Symmetry: D3
Subunit: 300 residues, 6 copies
Amino acid sequence: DARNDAVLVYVNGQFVPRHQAVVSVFDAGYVCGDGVWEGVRLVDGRIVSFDAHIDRMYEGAKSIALDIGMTRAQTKQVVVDTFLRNGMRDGAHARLMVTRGVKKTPNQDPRFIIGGATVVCVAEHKVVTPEAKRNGLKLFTSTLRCSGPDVFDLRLNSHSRLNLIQALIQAIQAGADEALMLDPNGFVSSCNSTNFFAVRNGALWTSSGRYCFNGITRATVVRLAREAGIPVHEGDFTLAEVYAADEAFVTGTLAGLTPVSSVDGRALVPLGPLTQRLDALYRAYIASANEAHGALPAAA
Amino acid sequence: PDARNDAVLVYVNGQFVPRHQAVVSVFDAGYVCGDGVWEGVRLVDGRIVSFDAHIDRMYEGAKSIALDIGMTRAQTKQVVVDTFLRNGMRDGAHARLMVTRGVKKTPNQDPRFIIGGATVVCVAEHKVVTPERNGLKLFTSTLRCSGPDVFDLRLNSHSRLNLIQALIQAIQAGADEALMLDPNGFVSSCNSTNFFAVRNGALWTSSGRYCFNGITRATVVRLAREAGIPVHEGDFTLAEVYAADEAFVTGTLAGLTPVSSVDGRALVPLGPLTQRLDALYRAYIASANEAHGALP
Amino acid sequence: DARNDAVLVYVNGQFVPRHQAVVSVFDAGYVCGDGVWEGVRLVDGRIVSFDAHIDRMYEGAKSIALDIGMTRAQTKQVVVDTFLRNGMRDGAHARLMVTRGVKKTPNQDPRFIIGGATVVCVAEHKVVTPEAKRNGLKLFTSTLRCSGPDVFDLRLNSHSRLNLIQALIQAIQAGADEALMLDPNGFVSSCNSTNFFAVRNGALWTSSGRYCFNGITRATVVRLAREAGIPVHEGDFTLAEVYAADEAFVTGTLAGLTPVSSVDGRALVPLGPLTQRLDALYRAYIASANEAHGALP
Amino acid sequence: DARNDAVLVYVNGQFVPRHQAVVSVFDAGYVCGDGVWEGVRLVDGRIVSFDAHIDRMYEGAKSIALDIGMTRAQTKQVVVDTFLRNGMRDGAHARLMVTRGVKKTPNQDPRFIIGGATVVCVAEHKVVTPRNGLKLFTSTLRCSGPDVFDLRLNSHSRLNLIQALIQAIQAGADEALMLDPNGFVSSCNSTNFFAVRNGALWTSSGRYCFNGITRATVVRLAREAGIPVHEGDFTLAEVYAADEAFVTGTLAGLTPVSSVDGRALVPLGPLTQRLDALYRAYIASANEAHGALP
Amino acid sequence: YAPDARNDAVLVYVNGQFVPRHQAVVSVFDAGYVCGDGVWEGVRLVDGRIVSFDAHIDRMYEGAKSIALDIGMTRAQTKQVVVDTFLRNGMRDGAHARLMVTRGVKKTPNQDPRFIIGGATVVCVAEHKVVTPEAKRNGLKLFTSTLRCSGPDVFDLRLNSHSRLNLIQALIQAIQAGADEALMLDPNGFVSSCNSTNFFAVRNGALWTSSGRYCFNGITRATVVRLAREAGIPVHEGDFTLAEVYAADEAFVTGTLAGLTPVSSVDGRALVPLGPLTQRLDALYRAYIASANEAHGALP
Amino acid sequence: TTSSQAYAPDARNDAVLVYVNGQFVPRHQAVVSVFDAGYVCGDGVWEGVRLVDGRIVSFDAHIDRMYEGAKSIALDIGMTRAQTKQVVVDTFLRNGMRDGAHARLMVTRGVKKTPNQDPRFIIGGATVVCVAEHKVVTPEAKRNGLKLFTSTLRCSGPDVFDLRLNSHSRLNLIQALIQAIQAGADEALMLDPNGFVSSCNSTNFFAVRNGALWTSSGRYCFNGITRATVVRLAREAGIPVHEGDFTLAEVYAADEAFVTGTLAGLTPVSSVDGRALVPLGPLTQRLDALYRAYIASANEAHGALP
Ligand SMILES: Cc1ncc(COP(=O)(O)O)c(C=O)c1O
């Protein structure tokens, strides 16, 4: 989308063209991966599941003693302002990135910070029709594991992403699009950047999320499934259960439900019936005037 | 603390940029994802201490994450040299060379869609660490060093929340630095320095299977063996620490820092073996050893 | 409480003045930490949740093949007699301690015990100060872990307590009052001597208890919560979920619900609304003529 | 030995007849298993490897912030005095037990201690005969890693070991063998474990068990006699196919192992016999490791 | 199983042939013999009905899929193998069959699954096997082996395979402790299963069994759980300890071959065999397997 | 489509006689009861040995591993070591092999009264099978090098399954191989439970970094004869050997890697997880030459054919 060349990026309250959207080399985010972020989608004038995203950011920031320096409402207003300044109402997404701040000297220690969080919001136009993603993802189960929370709590949506990127790198070399990752016990946990679901015998299966990002999209699809009386098995399941699944798909804010066409070269039919049903339910939900979605105000 | 640091010029992608303007894109993999490797080096009496050892670690770490540095070792070395030269630094300085995957078309974790090359940044700063080192308080964090199938701590990367989180806990315990156990509960390392204990005239340190394998650590081990001090490199416990004669940490920035307590258990700071190894280390880094790259 | 100086302690069927209440240096409890115990609270003539305590003791004793050498009723009678001998009817607590017995030689081997189990009951006056009048515990999450049951089953309420004391020692040196402990997987398990609870958005959260003492108080508070329609999250939760909690508190027979004012230096407002509601429910429950509480004669 | 009925036990500086040797029910040792101990053997007027034992006690005490309240010399003197008071010169053993002390109220918290550490020393006669050999069963219960409970500590908290022993006894065995968290052979519940394979001694690294003085002695004697010792990770398979096995501890010395999990080994194999003779010679010698009685 | 002279003369299905017992053979190059490379099911024939037949076939198809083993038959055809093996032997009642499907004959003996001449080897051993209540009622002695159930990233014990040394090893240790069967803990130390049967305990009127994350998910196990819930017996399917076993009121094990077998001790800790809830569930199970339920495949 | 298990096709292999329980049986007729413990349960141990210039390479070492493995699973082989040796010798002799051959000796617990796991139910003694085949693995066939993928499936600790056992229960290894095959690789590399490099699914793994040979401790994999030989040859030639915990990072930055086993000797590795390594680097070539010299010598380790 050619219009992406002319977007303004929010950087510490300045609206800046992409080629000039910059942060100090001393920023905690650049030096140390020291920050938390959220991606949100804008559909028909509404930021999808906005509060759920902001809640995860406030929880993640709290866990790393990172002062966001704004109330929830103010942080929301950053995103709102970024969409308004770009004239975006629909078919957009934004990545809100909050890093500890600019450091007196590049090192890990958070006490060496000049106070004031770095706040960046990258808003962009995008789009993809439901059976145009007809291209299922190929998944490869990486040898690199999800961590337990005494090592690194994967509920944290952080700027420290090498633990996930490394699994993706391995999956790419296996000819896959995305890594599936096991938890420390060997049960299926999640993909490197999306949550993983299987369909077995009319039932929806996904991990407990004890060892992966608990995506807002994952949460929404679970809820939609239960509300529709689809049985949901949220708990420990294996690669054997995946290879024998009827369908599989991944979830995340950027693409919604993406069908999976194979796992470790084991074929699954992309876009099976239950994927189709849940996708329709999700598409309806994100387009509705549901109170979970924050209506973008008109400009002043 | 040194007023000259306010005016240093930072290497960014071949340009020397004043401190307050030295910037990287918000789309850079280092900012978005902590996706990069770095090395810190110390400049002593015109010589970059253990320069090659630092560069080899960077090349191996970059290789591990399929990050093309986009430079030969000689070129990379030249970046650091040039950064010191541009700042008129000959002694009492430290530099952090940071290499991140590069500028992405869109901010996300996927390494594939990189416009252009690796981002290369070098921050040099005057950093005199006086021996006048009252000894660190350590607290053993509840947060663990990972095994290499989760996150290989030999990597010196821009993804450091795994270490920072241990440090945060130690800070709230009233300590200066976190000590970290490995997945089996043996002593591994500190959050930003390697850890050593002294027991009965012997030097003890972890195997390094689960922590950064620091250059300083390696140097101190080597000096110890060359001086006929016994070195136990292997699994040891909190109990062995609490009953030690001495303890100290190692890193490029500070050299040997004495430890005055671990989990509130007092140790006499700067014991005899710490003092000897410190003298050996200061001698070594100030010598015309072939391990150190002379500035022009 | 000055009265505590003069209490009589039950020792093997005798009432013994406190300063003379003694056990052989050959006792399995002393040599080896080899025994199980229960703490019970006496409130308004009633031993709180007495049966629940006794059932834990019988299960724990069974797990280490320790024959208590008494029926459940008889064991209860020890505690009853200990309170009655000391003229206690309210405001008291007792520790019933049952160790394997006197050994022919001091070593770990449980065989070759002279006689039966050693039975000791220490009753003492404690005023439990009102809810409003304590400003909350500081917790530090120790580096020392709760064990899995193939290493040491923390459901066991035993005389072998260095595994818990070690975590407490570390927490004390961090400036805290009590240790929080993670399980082998890194999820929150319990404190070193009390069970741990968090409140997150009007909901009560506590571990599954797979890796800690399953306290009677814990079990009571879970049940009270559900009976009151407070949602209860019993399952795996993290330090992150604690640091972002609205409230936290710990449970045990000695103090009831004790509010938590911080965890690893992260402030929590002590005695938040859900702590206060559950405390009122618990204080009501332990003072009621519920059938779970054994009336003194 | 009938003489054991009349021994005097050291309790806090007093020598107390056996049947009156007592500790408060408020003692940290009784309430909580909160203390450290050492077993020592007296051979031909010498306390075997005395300093080594005391050093482990001081290290263990330090790990649990237990103040013994005595210098090393004083602690040694308690044991010396206990043997002297009982007229023991040979064929005796003592257990020195140091618990945190008397509590104001029975609970786990180490802070509320009236006075100093409780110090108890039980000395007893035992003749150690020149012996059927132990049956060992590998318990399902594991040695812990040091972030759960460090088995180098020789403490009064012993149910973690007793539980393994209980399972072994019900399997018809005399002693539990115990694996480490990774499934490698670690130790027995109360003695260190050795296997003999191909002229070589095999024992665990000791990362996950008590580091016994006897174990250390046997390793050294083996190397001085040119028997190699492989201290490392080894498996049940390597035990079941061993030529011999034995256990070590202060109480019995080298005890042969005659089976593990029902798999027969030699009732007393040649290298066990050699090392036992070397050990008996060593503990009877005027070595500087042994503290001569007055 | 009660001694039965008729078993000496049974015909075994081998690759479409009915072969007398003493001649029923497979190539030394077969993947099953060289490598334990195959999946199997045991089924019980009661009053002309193969008990829970589809459930067994479903497990076989999932297990074969997990190891990329093509059974080379439709489910109907697979069923017909079993049917034919019972019919050929004139069995209508009081019989059991083991259906074994191995990857096939190899070009050379090695582990590599690619080197297969021809299709899967299919063997069906049917035998008269009444396990009398006389024989069963007194109960098994269990010993908790030191050898543990694996997590699914090492070996998924839901697989019913020809690679059984991981189970046999536990059993060998139990046999030498004077026990009949090994009980096995999972990697975390919780009770998982026996070496060849699923394990249940009864505590205070409630049925306890493991979650099955670390053991074979037996058909009989699943049937007993369902009968318990249908009878309003509480079921605690979850993590429990040896302490909870040693203090249980009753214990029993389940499997196709013997049904519910009472446990008389675990690690030498006595349990009264055939307690009231074991007897109730046993009565419910015997009723169920003898009924015209649609889960059971009627012989023609 | 590549194995580390491939060798020159050899028409003579159609007609070999297989030892089965004391008989020599034509290949197509060489059979075992469907009640055999090996078929039902994977219940047996095996050894593969290579015949070079009339000498069975490292024969005693193979036999010792078999006897130890059989002991570990209480399997009575029912033959002395000399008898067992003689079975393999006789199998090579009966097929006229003196060179360029490999045998797999398979000993399973025996015929069961009923197919189940219980080892008590055994009629008679152990089943003994020996399959000898002409198997030349040329250096030409090897020069391309194997592609490794690090499987998600891991080597077990010995309290789950002791990988020093060379058993008929091989789905634990085959599963890792299946995953590697679908990644486009020839063989699976496997990590140990701690995440350190352990072994391949059917061969031992080595890396070369800076003139030094690196291989795992072997605490968590088959302790191959070939592996042990290569370690000793390296030490004897003064090449430093790092036997201990190393990582995927250490592999991806290696100068060379190769795998070892009886069937192929030293096979160079060309990539691990898509990370290229030059196949047949200088230290692989030196160790290969040392190994070929060693297996062709009259070393005391090799069993002379009569
Ligand atoms: C699993 C495994 N790895 C590697 C090898 C290679 O070892 P060797 O050199 O002894 O054939 C073997 C031998 O069978 C093996 O079984």
